[PDB]
Symmetry: C2
Subunit: 51 residues, 2 copies
C-alpha cells in the first residue's frame, strides 16, 4: 500500500480581500479584484458579424 | 459712413443635440456630446508631483 498525500487547494483573491477556490464563484459572489469603469468594444468584421 | 455687417454667433451641439454658444456653459448645463465610462489616470512624476 502506497500512501497518497493530499494537497490543499490554494485560494485566489477577489474583491474585499475575500477568498474562494473557484473563480466562477468568487467572481459571482464577491466580484473582481480590481474594477474598471467600462469596456468600449470595437468590432472588425462583416455586417453579419456586427449584428 | 462705413457700414459694418454683423455675423451672429454659431451654436455648438452638446449632449442630446442641445445647442448653446458657450462651452463653459453648454457643458456645465447639458453635458458632453459623447460620454465615456471613465478616465484611468497615468502619472509620470516625482512623489511630490504625484501628491
Amino acid at each position: 500500500m502506497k500512501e497518497l498525500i493530499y494537497i490543499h487547494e490554494p485560494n485566489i483573491l477577489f474583491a474585499n480581500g475575500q477568498k474562494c477556490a473557484d473563480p466562477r464563484d468568487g467572481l459571482a459572489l464577491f466580484g473582481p479584484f480590481t474594477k474598471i469603469y467600462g469596456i468600449k468594444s470595437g468590432v472588425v468584421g462583416t455586417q453579419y458579424g456586427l449584428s
